[PDB]
Amino acid sequence: GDCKPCMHPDCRFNPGRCR
């Protein structure tokens, strides 16, 4: 990840952040 840290389940496609 880069924008929104992908250190949690939510970073599957962070809507508006890290896809």
What element of type H or E holds 16?
Answer: none
CB distance 9 to 16 below 8 Å? no
CA 18/CA 9 separation, integer angstroms: 12
Experimental approach taken: NMR
Q: How far apart are CA 9 and CA 17, in angstroms?
A: 14
And the tokens for 2? Answer: 């880069």
Q: Tell me how far apart the alpha carbons of residues 7 and 17 are, in angstroms, rounded to a whole number.
A: 14
Q: Which long-range contacts (CB under 8 A, 24 or more apart) does 5-13 make?
A: none
